[PDB]
Amino acid sequence: STDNAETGVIEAGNTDTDFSGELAAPGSNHTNVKFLFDRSRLLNVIKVLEKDAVFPRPFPTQEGAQQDDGYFCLLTPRPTVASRPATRFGLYANPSGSGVLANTSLDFNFYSLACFTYFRSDLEVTVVSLEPDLEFAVGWFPSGSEYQASSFVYDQLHVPFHFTGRTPRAFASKGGKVSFVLPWNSVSSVLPVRWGGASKLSSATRGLPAHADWGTIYAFVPRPNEKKSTAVKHVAVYIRYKNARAWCPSMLPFRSYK
């Protein structure tokens, strides 16, 4: 008015740009991005370990493999398949047949606000068991590292190593809940929600930032290996973001019509 929008930059216009009237008071500030995200949110559920664990393979895997799937949770908002970083997001709608269903995940409601390209925070790990009268134990190792899996016998009882180690553990109470905040540990600089690139120099799938992540939480009961029940059980995991920053804005997920 009478400016043209083809210069790429237009400002806003209050009521007295062309009409008679005065501008209105600012209402609130539930808008700042280091307050908006700070909400306790679960991403998924977890099958509980009870033995010597084994972790899934690299990208192709023929049948006859022996891994214990759906026991880890590579906690990121980024889409994840079988507890290792994927690039797309599945929803297994017609699950009849043979061959095991992979553990998918994604942080659903994060993208519907996300108009960003780069992100920066710290997080916290909140765990809760769904089955009653249960007592468990959560473990963790940082990004760019990998789980230790073996067992050493004590007085005829086979006990695995993930009771001990360097990286922290946590033992819950009688049906309690464990929570702690966890800082940055990534080799790269800021978390990407978009990426070009590839993992190695050549002959790699183009798009997955394999070492710009957080880490993973696994749950296990404090019992020796030979005293394990036949009923399997479950537990969920929750994340709340903290002290966040953001850079160089972008689009939003496309809404249906449909």
């Binding site: 008015s1 929008a5 083809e6 209105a24 600012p26 209402g27 991005v33």
Partner: protein
């Protein structure tokens, strides 16, 4: 002896919005630096006042191509006395599907303030027309012809050397905050329709094509403030 204490009813619970922090399980770490890359975000409202192209239902010629929905207006040559585009203001209507203020409003509950829409012409420079745009607060029926849209609140607009006309829907209201979507389409959540009419015919020389086009934008004004978030709609993922 220890200091005597009394635990209240709130034991061992965790609230999602609970404004406090928790003991870290591993601390005293450093991080890569930040400062080299520019473009911070302090508020998303610096984000929210960017132009955004609206999306409309196509006029009755459905092209069988994917998603026949159109970010412009095809003005007809023929003389009829009904408006070109008329759409309400409820920030979940299928005209507000992918506008920014619609998009980051779709997960909040209440806002306050103005809503700019502007419109960019696109046609041959030897063509010229006069277009008025008009707005009315909620009447009983909908204002249809030019007397009704005439009395209320409008601006006429030329075609010249520039190509746009910044318009701001004023903010009249019973209550200061307003909702974002209408579970019951009440007076608190709608604010009357918006339309634009052609006032005089588009005028253009020979051997240059008929039926010009106009794009629509939609942006937050100055006073546009948001509050109090809500859980989101995951229906984009299915």
């Amino acid at each position: 002896g220890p200091i005597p204490t009394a635990p209240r009813e709130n034991s061992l619970m965790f609230l999602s919005t609970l404004p406090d922090d928790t003991v870290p399980a591993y601390g005293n770490v450093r991080t890569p630096p930040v400062n080299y890359l520019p473009g911070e975000i302090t508020d998303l409202l610096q984000l929210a006042r960017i132009p955004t192209l609206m999306a409309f239902e196509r006029v009755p010629e459905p092209v069988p191509a994917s998603d026949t929905y159109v970010p412009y207006v095809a003005v007809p040559t023929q003389f009829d006395d009904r408006p070109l585009i008329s759409f309400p203001i409820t920030l979940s209507d299928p005209v507000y599907q992918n506008t920014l203020v619609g998009a980051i409003s779709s997960n909040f509950a209440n806002y306050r303030g103005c809503i700019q829409i502007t419109l960019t012409f696109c046609g041959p420079m030897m063509a010229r027309g006069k277009f008025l745009l008009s707005y009315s607060p909620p009447n009983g029926t909908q204002p249809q012809t030019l007397s009704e849209a005439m009395q209320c609140t409008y601006s006429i607009w030329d075609i010249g050397l520039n190509s746009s006309w910044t318009f701001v829907v004023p903010y009249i209201s019973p209550s200061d905050y307003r909702e974002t979507r209408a579970i019951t389409n009440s007076v608190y959540s709608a604010d009357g329709w918006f339309s634009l009419h052609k006032l005089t015919k588009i005028t253009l020389p020979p051997d240059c094509p008929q039926s010009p086009c106009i794009l629509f934008f939609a942006s937050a004004g100055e006073d546009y403030t948001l509050r109090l978030p809500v859980d989101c709609n995951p229906s984009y993922v299915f």
